Amino acid sequence: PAQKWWHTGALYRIGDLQAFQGHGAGNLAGLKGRLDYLSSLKVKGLVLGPIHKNQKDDVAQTDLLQIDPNFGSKEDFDSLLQSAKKKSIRVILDLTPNYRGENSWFSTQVDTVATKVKDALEFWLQAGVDGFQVRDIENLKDASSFLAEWQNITKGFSEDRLLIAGTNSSDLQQILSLLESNKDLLLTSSYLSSTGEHTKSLVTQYLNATGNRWCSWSLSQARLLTSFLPAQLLRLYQLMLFTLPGTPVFSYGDEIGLDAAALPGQPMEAPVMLWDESSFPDIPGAVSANMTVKGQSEDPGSLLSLFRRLSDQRSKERSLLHGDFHAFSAGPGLFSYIRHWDQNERFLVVLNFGDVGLSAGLQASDLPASASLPAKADLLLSTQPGREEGSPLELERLKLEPHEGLLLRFPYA
Amino acid sequence: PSVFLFPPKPKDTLMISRTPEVTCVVVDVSHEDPEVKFNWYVDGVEVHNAKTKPREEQYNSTYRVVSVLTVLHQDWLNGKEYKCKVSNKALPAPIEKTISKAKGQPREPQVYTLPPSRDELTKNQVSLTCLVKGFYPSDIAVLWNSRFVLENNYKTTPPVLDSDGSFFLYSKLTVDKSRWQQGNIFACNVYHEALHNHYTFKNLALS
Ligand SMILES: *[C@@H]1O[C@H](CO[C@@H]2O[C@@H](C)[C@@H](O)[C@@H](O)[C@@H]2O)[C@@H](O[C@@H]2O[C@H](CO)[C@@H](O[C@@H]3O[C@H](CO[C@H]4O[C@H](CO)[C@@H](O)[C@H](O)[C@@H]4O[C@@H]4O[C@H](CO)[C@@H](O[C@@H]5O[C@H](CO)[C@H](O)[C@H](O)[C@H]5O)[C@H](O)[C@H]4NC(C)=O)[C@@H](O)[C@H](O[C@H]4O[C@H](CO)[C@@H](O)[C@H](O)[C@@H]4O)[C@@H]3O)[C@H](O)[C@H]2NC(C)=O)[C@H](O)[C@H]1NC(C)=O
């Protein structure tokens, strides 16, 4: 199963150009100016838009082949891809049709709409697009079928073109039924939206039922992590998403812990991106410096620093790119696993989900002895500060603080 | 000669980015005896950091003299007492005035945003309403915003005393109907000592 560009790193959903880039500047030309920042996150693909002409609930004033001119010209898009390709950043285009409406898939026009997609797929693939996203698929009749059509069209143009399907479904069987027909299809879901053994179960059960095939890992198809997670679990969940076998998918602001509910006047799905203290309206008490990109850039302890380091690991280390995944038992609320490819550096992930400090209580015998644990492994990082990064920890004596995650590394041996 | 002592502004005590002041104002100061001495006491302890301003003749041929004492946020909120003593020749005795935060169990504001009445959709501009109630003491501030900017086209009523001894007010933000009818989000932002972090907000938007 050959390596593709979306296996090599995180995907980054930018669903609202103006929120992301700032007031008035929600243009494709302005996204160009942010590619360096994104490159600084080591993201491998932007999921963009939609940017197509959509008049709420007007199947006829919906041309997926024409950019809404508020975002800019087709030239700006051509120029964006060019600049994006040049920085090794791939571009996925969201083509969810009625994105201005409430049912993205319109109503009573199931075949009429699909056609515009089919035509859009071709048009945009010719324009130089690296893949497509379509959300809210549970509000699409003949879901399983329509996705297979678009898959085969996308894969037909090139095996190096991705189609992402998004759903609000958190039910395993419904997700498997969509994936039964198309198994090379990236499916973002609410599957992972608690218990350390339960997140363990969810992950292991999913991989179990999909024969350890490639998948996405996310919390949702669109929403920030903060929609599902309290602040104290963000760092842990980032460590996990960046170290689980598959493509981690985030939305803009996840790297700074952007929480729409904590910010006045912000829609859940598109809060203003906090570049600096001038980004948000002057509402005192709403945004401190340590909630912004600028502030968190200056702080090695920041969630953005952690994001950057994890994205770096995930995009350069073979064991994380395409390593095996072996979970094993630990203390009640611990989720522990190793990633191992061939004879490359191994990684041990130990995640403390509970809010009590715990002994890891790792048991190395349930693991296959292809990569059983050394006595001591170098701590790459902890989610919490004050540990001794770059120096060994004794694996049998691991004590994790509440909500602490650890990333250990050890060579083949 | 008469004295009026004024508390700091709510925004100044609640938002720690700003500098609260107590203000001692002396009026009916004669041309014959215009010299005024101010003494300041915080909980009976004399302080010397006050800034007295140059006396200013009013149209009624009297002088108004003002002394300003900077206060610490927490001192005001913790109920410390600020005393201004005014001495002047025309006075039989110095005039002493004392001010502090209202005493009484602080009560957390409830914040309820209310959309325009349907009947207002006749008009070009609509009224977005923020009811704040159940708060004590009366010191409070209210600000509006939309997704990207402050919204300044608003007016806020003074606090009104409610039946239960708490206070309420309403803030009214006027916006173009189209902005409302297009589903844009607005937020009413409230500052009060009895909120967590002295701050909360509630959004308002069409369904
Ligand atoms: C000669 O003239 C002077 C000056 O008066 C002005 O000029 C004359 C010529 C006329 O045009 C007047 O109409 C003008 O006002 C006369 O002085 C007046 O004496 C009055 C008493 O007889 C006195 O009344 C008392 O007012 C209190 C409230 O005063 C507030 O509000 C009024 C408006 O309502 C305003 O004019 C005052 O300046 C004062 O404003 C507040 O000032 C403080 C301090 O600056 C502000 O707080 C500070 O603000 C800064 C930022 O600016 C910063 O944030 C600080 O942190 C903060 O502390 C505050 O924001 C201002 N408020 C407002 C709304 O702007 C009442 O409380 C008081 O009531 C009590 O007594 C009454 C009886 O007298 C009772 O009925 C009542 O129940 C209460 O018990 C009084 O009504 C006037 O304030 C005073 N005027 C001025 C300008 O000082 C003088 O009398 C006259 N001589 C004669 C002819 O006898």
Residue numbers in the entry:
A (entry chain A): 214 to 406, 410 to 629
B (entry chain B): 238 to 444
Publication passage describing the model:
Here, we report the engineering and characterization of a BBB transport vehicle targeting the CD98 heavy chain (CD98hc or SLC3A2) of heterodimeric amino acid transporters (TVCD98hc). One such BBB transport target is the CD98 heavy chain (CD98hc, also called 4F2, Slc3a2).
To gain insight into the molecular basis for the TV-CD98hc interaction, TV6.6 was co-crystalized with the extracellular domain of human CD98hc. The complex structure was refined to 2.25 Å resolution, with electron density of interacting residue sidechains well resolved. Surface complementarity at the complex interface is high, with a total buried surface area of 1551 Å2, consistent with the 230 nM affinity of TV6.6 for human CD98hc. Structural determinants at the complex interface also agree with the engineered TV binding data. In particular, the TV makes van der Waals contacts with Glu229, Gln231, His236, Ala477-Pro483 Ala486, Val488, and Pro497-Pro500 of CD98hc, rationalizing the engineering of an extensive hydrophobic surface on the TV that includes the Glu380Leu, Gly385Phe, Gln386Val, Pro387Leu, Val422Ile, Met428Tyr and Gln438Phe mutations. In the complex structure, the backbone of the β-sheet region on TV6.6 is minimally perturbed compared to wild-type Fc, with a Cα RMSD of 0.415 Å. This is consistent with the limited functional sequence space within the TV6 family, as only a subset of amino acids satisfies the strict secondary structure requirements while preserving binding to CD98hc. Whereas a rigid backbone Fc structure is maintained, flexibility within the Pro480-Pro483 and Ser495-Ser504 loop regions on CD98hc likely contributes to high-affinity binding. This is reflected in a 3-4 Å shift for the latter, compared to canonical CD98hc structures.
